[PDB]
Copies of this chain bind each other. A is one copy, B any other.
């Protein structure tokens, strides 16, 4: 598919057995998902945006479907106002920016 950028590039994702909306974000190294009770072990992390740092929980090897494309990798969970799919998962679904 092709997604234009006139509005935020939001798609449906499936994570943890839940459907959510998330932003496809070429400017994010990592994937940051809103607070959710994912099972299993995690590691504390701090990540920085414009603005400063926030505390997140790093979960590894998390299965996630992005606009129908299955992916597996690290997901950072914490208090974000928007779910962000970053390059660690965008590469897995073969996404490019084109102009």
Contacts and interface: CB of A to CB of B under 8 A. Distances in A.
A95 interface: yes
Given A48-B50, A54-B50, A87-B8, A97 B27 contact: no
Contacts of A97: 2-3, 5, 9, 24, 26, 90, 95-98
Oligomeric state, in copies: 2
Contacts of A50: 32, 47-51, 54, 80-81, 84
A12 to B, nearest CB: 14
Interface string A17-51: 00000011111110010000000000000011111
B1 A99 contact: yes
A1 B98 contact: yes
